[PDB]
Design an enzyme around this catalytic site. Structure first.
Site, PDB file in Angstrom:
ATOM      1  N   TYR A 144      30.632   5.923   5.901  1.00 29.72           N
ATOM      2  CA  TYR A 144      30.173   6.275   4.655  1.00 29.72           C
ATOM      3  C   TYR A 144      31.203   5.913   3.574  1.00 29.72           C
ATOM      4  O   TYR A 144      32.392   5.721   3.888  1.00 29.72           O
ATOM      5  CB  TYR A 144      29.838   7.749   4.498  1.00 29.72           C
ATOM      6  CG  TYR A 144      30.814   8.716   5.007  1.00 29.72           C
ATOM      7  CD1 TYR A 144      31.898   9.091   4.241  1.00 29.72           C
ATOM      8  CD2 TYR A 144      30.706   9.281   6.293  1.00 29.72           C
ATOM      9  CE1 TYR A 144      32.804  10.032   4.678  1.00 29.72           C
ATOM     10  CE2 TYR A 144      31.624  10.255   6.709  1.00 29.72           C
ATOM     11  CZ  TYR A 144      32.685  10.572   5.879  1.00 29.72           C
ATOM     12  OH  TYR A 144      33.546  11.562   6.341  1.00 29.72           O
TER      13      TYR A 144
ATOM     14  N   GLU B 203      32.958   7.275  -0.065  1.00 27.57           N
ATOM     15  CA  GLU B 203      33.318   8.525  -0.764  1.00 27.57           C
ATOM     16  C   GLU B 203      33.895   8.044  -2.124  1.00 27.57           C
ATOM     17  O   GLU B 203      34.434   6.922  -2.176  1.00 27.57           O
ATOM     18  CB  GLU B 203      34.478   9.274  -0.127  1.00 27.57           C
ATOM     19  CG  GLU B 203      34.112   9.842   1.207  1.00 27.57           C
ATOM     20  CD  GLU B 203      33.189  11.046   1.085  1.00 27.57           C
ATOM     21  OE1 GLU B 203      32.017  10.886   1.388  1.00 27.57           O
ATOM     22  OE2 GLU B 203      33.562  12.131   0.663  1.00 27.57           O
TER      23      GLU B 203
ATOM     24  N   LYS C 203      39.537  19.449  -7.016  1.00 35.76           N
ATOM     25  CA  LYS C 203      39.191  18.073  -6.617  1.00 35.76           C
ATOM     26  C   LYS C 203      37.725  18.009  -6.129  1.00 35.76           C
ATOM     27  O   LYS C 203      37.322  18.865  -5.357  1.00 35.76           O
ATOM     28  CB  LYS C 203      40.104  17.555  -5.509  1.00 35.76           C
ATOM     29  CG  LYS C 203      40.123  16.000  -5.285  1.00 35.76           C
ATOM     30  CD  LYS C 203      41.084  15.518  -4.249  1.00 35.76           C
ATOM     31  CE  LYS C 203      41.274  14.003  -4.310  1.00 35.76           C
ATOM     32  NZ  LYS C 203      42.326  13.699  -3.259  1.00 35.76           N
TER      33      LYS C 203
ATOM     34  N   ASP D  77      31.888  17.325  -1.902  1.00 35.51           N
ATOM     35  CA  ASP D  77      32.936  18.210  -1.422  1.00 35.51           C
ATOM     36  C   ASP D  77      33.803  18.660  -2.597  1.00 35.51           C
ATOM     37  O   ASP D  77      34.141  17.827  -3.443  1.00 35.51           O
ATOM     38  CB  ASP D  77      33.795  17.490  -0.406  1.00 35.51           C
ATOM     39  CG  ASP D  77      33.093  17.330   0.980  1.00 35.51           C
ATOM     40  OD1 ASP D  77      32.320  18.229   1.352  1.00 35.51           O
ATOM     41  OD2 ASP D  77      33.382  16.315   1.644  1.00 35.51           O
TER      42      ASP D  77
HETATM   43  C1  LIG Z   1      40.016  11.601   8.487  1.00 36.45           C
HETATM   44  O1  LIG Z   1      40.146  12.363   7.269  1.00 36.45           O
HETATM   45  C2  LIG Z   1      39.047  12.717   6.544  1.00 36.45           C
HETATM   46  C3  LIG Z   1      39.206  13.641   5.519  1.00 36.45           C
HETATM   47  C4  LIG Z   1      38.085  14.177   4.925  1.00 36.45           C
HETATM   48  C5  LIG Z   1      36.810  13.685   5.259  1.00 36.45           C
HETATM   49  C6  LIG Z   1      35.558  14.115   4.528  1.00 36.45           C
HETATM   50  C7  LIG Z   1      35.382  13.269   3.321  1.00 36.45           C
HETATM   51  N1  LIG Z   1      36.577  13.623   2.497  1.00 36.45           N
HETATM   52  C8  LIG Z   1      36.217  14.712   1.554  1.00 36.45           C
HETATM   53  C9  LIG Z   1      37.341  15.150   0.775  1.00 36.45           C
HETATM   54  C10 LIG Z   1      38.371  14.029   0.705  1.00 36.45           C
HETATM   55  C11 LIG Z   1      38.169  12.791   1.336  1.00 36.45           C
HETATM   56  C12 LIG Z   1      39.112  11.788   1.250  1.00 36.45           C
HETATM   57  C13 LIG Z   1      40.243  11.971   0.453  1.00 36.45           C
HETATM   58  O2  LIG Z   1      41.189  11.010   0.227  1.00 36.45           O
HETATM   59  C14 LIG Z   1      40.474  13.193  -0.128  1.00 36.45           C
HETATM   60  O3  LIG Z   1      41.623  13.338  -0.794  1.00 36.45           O
HETATM   61  C15 LIG Z   1      39.549  14.209  -0.011  1.00 36.45           C
HETATM   62  C16 LIG Z   1      36.723  12.684   6.144  1.00 36.45           C
HETATM   63  C17 LIG Z   1      37.811  12.224   6.824  1.00 36.45           C
END
Ligand SMILES: COc1ccc(CCNCCc2ccc(O)c(O)c2)cc1
EC number: 3.5.99.14
Length: 155
Positions: free
Chosen positions: A69, A71, A83, A102
């Site tokens: 996906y 983001e 955030k 999120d």
């Molecule tokens: C392997 O690590 C992961 C971390 C979070 C997710 C969920 C999507 N991330 C939602 C919040 C978020 C995502 C990326 C960012 O750089 C950030 O600062 C904050 C997926 C994988």
């Protein structure tokens, strides 16, 4: 129509809000997500300097759902330590979900203490509610909170 669902997670952390927010707002965070969370990624492509508007194209190794996906950082609010990161393509958007957001809010509790308040809001077509309910959890935000806490505290 869609239905709106909101799920929430909290972690107490024995470090200041300022210290915790330093990591969540670090512009290098996106590019280092595989160090922060090892063994998750097949590919990670980042468009942007790490600040608001940055897009992360995330592909996960076989056996992980979702597989890929995109983001986008929608808000990186230093005054409120708030955030917002939006799933903008792929992922749950291919499972009847029309909006996925999120939110992470780092809230001070004491001189050297804070609570990381993570939540996920999604909007889902009614016939898909039962299918996505067990798949969309706070798991990924809790994993990130656990790892950031540990990175700040552990000696
Ligand atoms: C392997 O690590 C992961 C971390 C979070 C997710 C969920 C999507 N991330 C939602 C919040 C978020 C995502 C990326 C960012 O750089 C950030 O600062 C904050 C997926 C994988």
């Amino acid at each position: 129509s869609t239905v709106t669902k909101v799920i929430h997670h909290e972690l107490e952390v024995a470090a200041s809000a300022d210290d915790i927010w330093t990591v969540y707002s670090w512009p290098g965070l996106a590019k280092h997500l595989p160090d922060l969370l090892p063994g998750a990624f097949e590919k990670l492509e980042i468009i942007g300097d790490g600040g608001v508007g940055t897009i992360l194209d995330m592909t996960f190794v076989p056996g992980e759902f979702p597989h890929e996906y995109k983001e986008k950082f929608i808000l990186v609010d230093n005054e409120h330590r708030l955030k917002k990161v939006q799933m903008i393509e792929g992922g749950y958007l291919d499972l009847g979900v029309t909006y996925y957001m999120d939110t992470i809010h780092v809230v001070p509790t004491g001189k050297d203490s804070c609570v990381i308040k993570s939540s996920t809001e999604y909007h889902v077509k009614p016939e898909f509610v039962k299918i996505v309910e067990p798949l969309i959890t706070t798991g990924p935000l809790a994993a990130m909170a656990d790892a950031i806490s540990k990175l700040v505290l552990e000696h």
